[PDB]
Amino acid sequence: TFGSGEADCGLRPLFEKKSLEDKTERELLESYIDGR
Amino acid sequence: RPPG
Amino acid sequence: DFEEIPEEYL
């Protein structure tokens, strides 16, 4: 909806809500500089 | 996704 | 190409 739309916005069930990481998640994370 |  | 959908949406 807005500045952080919904309320439980972008918390994927099968993943975040489940603490499961997808095949290509960390790849993104590493770009934010580093996995440190 | 239109090309120019 | 596209499997038919319920002609209720259509």
Binding site: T1, F2, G3, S4, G5, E6, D8, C9, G10, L11, R12, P13, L14, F15, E16, D22, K23, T24, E25, E27, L28, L29, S31, Y32 | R1, P2, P3, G4 | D1, F2, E3, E4, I5, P6, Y9, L10
Partner: protein
């Protein structure tokens, strides 16, 4: 989507299929921002040159779809457009300036393992995330290759593809095309020196460009699939509708217009 990979189940809960009632067809990508609001690129709706000018009546929105082709009985949700909302400063007639469309769903869509909205970036989510080097996730059911005579193989993806492209510097984005670029747009993709592949393509437009925030663990929609010149071209980059710069139009409508 070129040089991507098939998505994972519930890898992108917000993906939305812009399905053409008749001819039965994929119009573009879209994104679930609410139980009732759907984000799309404006041009999926209105493009004079291709003579695009769909009435809400003409489309259905398909959320929670993994397959492009199948009609996924018990996982996917097919919706009816109540009202379409196009950017008032949208310039098709030029470089697609402010390529953003909103659609209100007649009724509220049901969250499931497959259906869930993404977040809209806050001034601070944006500042930190929207940085050159940082990778976005482009999802859609569009071309796997730039349209070619000489191309052999099936060009349409069976399943939704996922591609991860880093944010490029304006300048670089600027020096790449003879098109007038603006702040309403951005570019993502591998610089030459990087010798890597993957881009969105014809049919991917409307589709989210999301980034995951270390900050708090949520997925935010950064860009809308816009345009380009070729798909996966050497030296070329994809152009995204910069959601944040355009957020206040977004909030204004959702506000006096609905939920």
């Amino acid at each position: 989507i070129v040089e991507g990979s098939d998505a994972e189940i519930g890898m992108s809960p917000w993906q939305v299929m812009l399905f053409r009632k008749s001819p039965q067809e994929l119009l573009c990508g879209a994104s679930l921002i609410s139980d009732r609001w759907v984000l799309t690129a404006a041009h999926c709706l209105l493009y004079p040159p291709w003579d695009k000018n769909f009435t809400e009546n003409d489309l259905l929105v398909r959320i929670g779809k993994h397959s492009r082709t199948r009609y996924e009985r018990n996982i996917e949700k097919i919706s009816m457009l109540e009202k379409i909302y196009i950017h008032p400063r949208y310039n098709w007639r030029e470089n697609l300036d402010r390529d953003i469309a909103l659609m209100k769903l007649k009724k509220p869509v049901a969250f499931s393992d497959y259906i869930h909205p993404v977040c809209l970036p806050d001034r601070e989510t944006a500042a930190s995330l929207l940085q050159a080097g940082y990778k976005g996730r482009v999802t859609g059911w569009g071309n796997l290759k730039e349209t070619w005579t000489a191309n052999v193989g099936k060009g349409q993806p069976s399943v939704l593809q996922v591609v991860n492209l880093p944010i490029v510097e304006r300048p670089v984005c600027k020096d790449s095309t003879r098109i007038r670029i603006t702040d309403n747009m951005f570019c993502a993709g591998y610089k030459p020196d990087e010798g890597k592949r993957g881009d969105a393509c014809e049919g991917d437009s409307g589709g989210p460009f999301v980034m995951k925030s270390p900050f708090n663990n949520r997925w935010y929609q950064m860009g809308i699939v816009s345009w380009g010149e070729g798909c996966d071209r050497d030296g070329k980059y994809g152009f995204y509708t910069h959601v944040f710069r355009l957020k206040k139009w977004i909030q204004k409508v959702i506000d006096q217009f609905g939920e």
